[PDB]
From Swiss-Prot, chain A:
Cellular location(s): Cytoplasm; Nucleus, Nucleolus
Biological processes per GO annotation: translation
UniProt entry tagged with the keyword Nucleus: yes
Organism: Oryctolagus cuniculus
Name by which UniProt lists this protein: Small ribosomal subunit protein uS8
UniProtKB/Swiss-Prot annotation, chain D:
Gene Ontology process terms (BP): translation
Record's protein name: Small ribosomal subunit protein eS21
Principal location: cytoplasm
Gene3D superfamilies reported for this sequence: 3.30.1230.20
Family (UniProt): Belongs to the eukaryotic ribosomal protein eS21 family.
Covalent cross-link (Glycyl lysine isopeptide (Lys-Gly) (interchain with G-Cter in SUMO2)), residues: 41
Record organism: Oryctolagus cuniculus (Rabbit)
Stated role: Component of the small ribosomal subunit. The ribosome is a large ribonucleoprotein complex responsible for the synthesis of proteins in the cell.
Protein encoded by which gene: RPS21
A GO cellular-component term linked to this record: ribonucleoprotein complex
Keywords carried by this UniProt record: Acetylation, Cytoplasm, Endoplasmic reticulum, Isopeptide bond, Ribonucleoprotein, Ribosomal protein, Ubl conjugation
Positions of post-translational N-acetylmethionine modification: 1
PANTHER family associated with the record: 40S RIBOSOMAL PROTEIN S21
Family matches, as InterPro entries: Ribosomal_eS21 (IPR001931), Ribosomal_eS21_CS (IPR018279), Ribosomal_eS21_sf (IPR038579)
GO molecular function, one term: structural constituent of ribosome
From Swiss-Prot, chain E:
Entry's Gene Ontology BP terms: translation
GO CC terms of this entry: cytosolic ribosome; nucleolus; ribonucleoprotein complex
Annotated crosslink Glycyl lysine isopeptide (Lys-Gly) (interchain with G-Cter in SUMO1) location: 103
Protein name per UniProt: Small ribosomal subunit protein eS17
Keywords: Cytoplasm, Isopeptide bond, Nucleus, Phosphoprotein, Ribonucleoprotein, Ribosomal protein, Ubl conjugation
Organismal lineage: Eukaryota, Metazoa, Chordata, Craniata, Vertebrata
Originating organism: Oryctolagus cuniculus
Record Gene3D superfamilies: Ribosomal protein S17e-like
Gene name tied to this protein: RPS17
UniProtKB/Swiss-Prot annotation, chain F:
Top-rank taxon, per record: Eukaryota
Subunit and interaction comment: Component of the small ribosomal subunit. Identified in a IGF2BP1-dependent mRNP granule complex containing untranslated mRNAs. Part of the small subunit (SSU) processome, composed of more than 70 proteins and the RNA chaperone small nucleolar RNA (snoRNA) U3.
Protein family: Belongs to the universal ribosomal protein uS4 family.
Biological role stated in the UniProt entry: Component of the small ribosomal subunit. The ribosome is a large ribonucleoprotein complex responsible for the synthesis of proteins in the cell. Part of the small subunit (SSU) processome, first precursor of the small eukaryotic ribosomal subunit. During the assembly of the SSU processome in the nucleolus, many ribosome biogenesis factors, an RNA chaperone and ribosomal proteins associate with the nascent pre-rRNA and work in concert to generate RNA folding, modifications, rearrangements and cleavage as well as targeted degradation of pre-ribosomal RNA by the RNA exosome.
Subcellular location(s) of the protein: Cytoplasm; Nucleus, Nucleolus
Site of covalent link Glycyl lysine isopeptide (Lys-Gly) (interchain with G-Cter in SUMO2): 28
Native organism: Oryctolagus cuniculus
Protein name: Small ribosomal subunit protein uS4
Length: 129, 208, 226, 82, 126, 65
RNA sequence: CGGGAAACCAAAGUCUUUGGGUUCCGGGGGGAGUAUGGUUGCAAAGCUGAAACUUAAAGGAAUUGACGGAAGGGCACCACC
RNA sequence: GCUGCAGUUAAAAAGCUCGUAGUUGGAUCUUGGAGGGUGCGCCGUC
């Protein structure tokens, strides 16, 4: 069955972009999916998206450009300690310079750069570049 | 429209097309061709969109102009129904030829005696002419093509839906292309009609 | 030097532009993705002052009617020191030919490398923009950007290829049967070549681009023959 | 690809597909674009002045290059009701 | 059989015939003289063997076009033959007979035409 | 600016400069990363006693010292 | 497309760009499913399961000959008729 | 072999399923303007 819903949305995306696709319909969506789709959006890795309202759990249409090499999800959502964030981005990001680790902290779902600036930390959601 | 008016449909042409039985289309659609399809006739057969067949043909024509050296557009057919057809196209527009057994190593392979470096290939059956369509994709050359409803779309950018089951459908479409290209960047002038009878394109064949 | 230059004559329009001093850098070819079939083209545009190192010799064989056969296989790598490299394997009757052909093969294959900054981009790129990996029949090489002074941390054979490519500093990790040298070098070759394929945010924006020297030079590249 | 003092380094900036916005990289010679002529309106008279699109090896091997051209040609004309 | 002409011979025959058809003949004796005029052949046995096979060809050509040989005269002959066209065959005779739907094909194509209806029955696969 | 990075970085630099091993623009960390062995080796006695006549050999120098 | 050493594989794909859930077994080959204790069995046997010692390849896949009392094969009085 | 292994054929998915512990669990409840750090010659950049 389902343990997580994010992992499906992310994968669906990745296969869309790999095909050469410019849109996807993910299902079923969640506040966390929105928040993650949103961080991606702010940065350029996707275009605009749209939450369609079935009387159920939702369905999202993402319009994607093609700046996206990969958006992954980290499971389980490990706790990170401010100097485990430095260790994570190195593990899974292309160059020190770019790509984001996106985690969930007490003060919001955020990319790790925003994390560093706020100076808060938490549990790791996923990534992209 | 687009480029602005006259260039639209002309009953005169929609008449030659319907006459030549182009739009008739294959019973097996194929997925990448679904757009061309107007409607499915009862007793299985599909009606191609001549309007669409038209406009793409013009789009093709335009891409053939813009190649500066007309010789280096290669019109190609191993199919019989398209052999006199392409020979004629090459006579009018610059356009060098490749009929019959394409001969493998013609695009890749300097050494060979049919070595050609076209800047544009136009093919008549993507299934029969698969070799040229493959070789072309080994060396960055764009492709116009003859496609019925169930033809390979791989490595062909620009299709002009036809009928290619045959008759004059293959004749007319090569005719109209040459007619179109001579109009554009040529010198027919006055996207007015033909001193050339389209039959001149069209397959020959046998003798008793 | 004086030995009497040959008389290259070109099969290919791309070649004519090159000899004519119409095409001056490989970049034109690379941007256009023109295929290169005449080795001299590579030779004229670069390669001049590009050094070729022979990586391996190992012999093989297959069975005849009346028993055996055996022959020499040479692995050659070519590259300046900056940003260009190629790799060629050949097997031939004689070592000299095997090497001579291998070099030709390597040159045809010459590939772009995108070299980048570990992070603070001062005084020009020392390493790689991102991390790129390549696989060849179960060997896989991963290149990782590294800080200055790190150098090429790779096996000797790989270090040699990366060196010619013109990479200063890079971390590597290799998995698979590293022993089978032809495979390992091939994967690393794929790895480096992949750098151009990476799209970074720097690259995000587009472009009238180019008309292609083939088109502009078109007359030029139909001489007076046939 | 800036350097220290806003300088432009490494060695080239590749063209990007007209359909997928993905780098044409650099030795993939199973890919090409397509110069469409501009017309001096009115009609005929090829006048330059290319309208041009570049299509990736990928799209073409997946049995697109064509349509992509049409989204491309109509969206920017010519081509209408496609 | 035992005498199967080899390429060096067979080639020369195709060769001469291509550039010599109106000169050459039906008869061994004369081409043999002709090969002296139109070709330089080193031994007499070869030249004979050539003259001979090319004659066997000429004998065949002069009874039906042969699989891989072309000469200016044969091209001209095919050219003229490849003209034919009668009263002409379609007509098709007053009135096309349609299969209907093909009738509905015109009916919903905005197109007048001649007519006839006989289109019914389904319709097995295989 | 990170008290740890500031306090120790500046110190490493100042130490590296007192010995001449390092220079100012270097004299930031971004430059030590792009440095080498000669730069140290150049500061030993032996090569200096050459470097101002008072030896005329890296040789002479070491036996002198 | 993509995977795999390939044979192959629309799953053996989405695996160095390595992270959807869970469960099980393997770490060179032989000694060995053997010894020994436990357990189940009327019995035959089953489950769990070592070591000492032995040894540098065991093995997989593809490629090619050689060779066949495998199939279509041919050719020659150095073969038969 | 957490990070970071392999198990169709190489050493390795129990004949199959039920099933407690253990592990694992769908969507959904709040919505430019200036202050301070270091670079570049009174101006600004981040």
């Amino acid at each position: 069955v389902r343990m997580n819903v994010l992992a499906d949305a992310l994968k669906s995306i990745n296969n869309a972009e790999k095909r050469g696709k410019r849109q996807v319909l993910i299902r079923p969506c969640s506040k966390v999916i929105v928040r993650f789709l949103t961080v991606m959006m702010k940065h350029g890795y996707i275009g605009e998206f749209e939450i369609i309202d079935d009387h159920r759990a939702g369905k999202i249409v993402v319009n994607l450009t093609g700046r996206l090499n990969k958006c992954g999800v980290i499971s389980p959502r490990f706790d990170v300690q401010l100097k485990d964030l430095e260790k994570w981005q190195n593990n899974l990001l292309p160059s020190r310079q770019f790509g984001f680790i996106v985690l969930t902290t007490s003060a919001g779902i955020m990319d790790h750069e925003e994390a560093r600036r706020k100076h808060t930390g938490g549990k790791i959601l996923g990534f992209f570049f | 429209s687009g480029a602005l008016d006259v260039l639209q449909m002309k009953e005169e042409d929609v008449l030659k097309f319907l006459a030549a039985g182009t739009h008739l289309g294959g019973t097996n659609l194929d997925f990448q061709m679904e757009q061309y399809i107007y409607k499915r006739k009862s007793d299985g057969i599909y009606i191609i969109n001549l309007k669409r067949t038209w406009e793409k043909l013009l789009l093709a024509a335009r891409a053939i102009v813009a190649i500066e050296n007309p010789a280096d557009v290669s019109v190609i057919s191993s199919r019989n129904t398209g052999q006199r057809a392409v020979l004629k196209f090459a006579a009018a527009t610059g356009a060098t030829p490749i009929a019959g057994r394409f001969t493998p190593g013609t695009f890749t392979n300097q050494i060979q005696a049919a070595f050609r470096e076209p800047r544009l290939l136009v093919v008549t059956d993507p299934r029969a002419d698969h070799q040229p369509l493959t070789e072309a994709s080994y060396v960055n050359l764009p492709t116009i093509a003859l496609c019925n409803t169930d033809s390979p779309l791989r490595y062909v950018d620009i299709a002009i839906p036809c009928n290619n089951k045959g008759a004059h459908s293959v004749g007319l479409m090569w005719w109209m292309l040459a007619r179109e290209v001579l109009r554009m960047r040529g010198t027919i002038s006055r996207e007015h009609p033909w001193e050339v009878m389209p039959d001149l394109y069209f397959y020959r064949d046998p003798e008793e | 030097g004086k030995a009497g230059d040959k008389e290259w004559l070109p099969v290919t329009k791309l070649g004519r532009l090159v000899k004519d001093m119409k095409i001056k850098s490989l970049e034109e070819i690379y941007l256009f993705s023109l295929p290169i079939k005449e080795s001299e083209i590579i030779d004229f545009f670069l390669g001049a002052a590009l050094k070729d190192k022979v990586l391996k010799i190992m012999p093989v064989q297959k069975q005849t009617q009346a028993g055996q056969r055996t022959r020499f296989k040479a692995f050659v790598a070519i590259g300046d020191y900056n940003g260009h490299v190629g790799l060629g394997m050949k097997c031939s009757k004689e070592v000299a030919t095997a090497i001579r052909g291998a070099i030709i093969l390597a040159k045809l294959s010459i590939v772009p490398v995108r070299r980048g900054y570990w992070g603070n981009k001062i005084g020009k790129p020392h390493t790689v923009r991102c991390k790129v990996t390549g696989r060849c029949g179960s060997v896989l090489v991963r290149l990782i950007p590294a800080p200055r002074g790190t150098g090429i941390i790779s096996a000797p054979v790989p270090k040699k290829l990366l060196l010619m490519a013109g990479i200063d500093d890079c971390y590597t990790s290799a998995g698979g049967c590293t022993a089978t040298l032809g495979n390992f070098a091939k994967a690393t070759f794929d790895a480096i070549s992949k750098t151009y394929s990476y799209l970074t945010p720097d690259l995000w924006k587009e472009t009238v681009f180019t008309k292609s020297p083939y088109q502009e030079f078109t007359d030029h590249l139909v001489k007076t023959h046939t | 690809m800036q350097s220290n003092a806003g300088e432009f380094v490494d060695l080239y900036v590749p063209r990007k597909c007209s359909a997928s916005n993905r780098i044409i990289g650099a030795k993939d010679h199973a890919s090409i674009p397509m110069n469409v002529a501009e017309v001096d309106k009115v009609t005929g008279r090829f006048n330059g002045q290319s309208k041009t699109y570049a299509i990736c090896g990928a799209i073409r091997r997946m049995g697109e290059s064509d349509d992509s051209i049409l989204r491309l040609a109509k969206s920017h004309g010519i081509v209408s009701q496609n | 059989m035992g005498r199967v002409r080899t390429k060096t011979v067979k080639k020369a025959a195709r060769v001469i015939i291509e550039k010599y058809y109106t000169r050459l003949g039906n008869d061994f004796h004369t081409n043999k003289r002709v090969c002296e005029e139109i070709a330089i052949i080193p031994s007499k046995k070869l030249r004979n063997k050539i003259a001979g096979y090319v004659t066997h060809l000429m004998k065949r050509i002069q009874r039906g076009p042969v699989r891989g040989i072309s000469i200016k005269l044969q091209e001209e002959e095919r050219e003229r033959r490849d003209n034919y066209v009668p009263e002409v065959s379609a007509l098709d005779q007053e009135i096309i007979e349609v299969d209907p739907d093909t009738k509905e094909m015109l009916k919903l194509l905005d197109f007048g035409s001649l007519s006839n209806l006989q289109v019914t029955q389904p319709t097995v696969g295989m | 600016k990170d008290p740890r990075r500031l306090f120790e970085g500046n110190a490493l630099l100042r130490r590296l400069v007192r010995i001449g091993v390092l220079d100012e623009g270097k004299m930031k960390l971004d430059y030590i990363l792009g440095l080498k062995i000669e730069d140290f080796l150049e500061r030993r006695l032996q090569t200096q006693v050459f470097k101002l006549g008072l030896a005329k050999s890296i040789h002479h120098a070491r036996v002198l010292i």
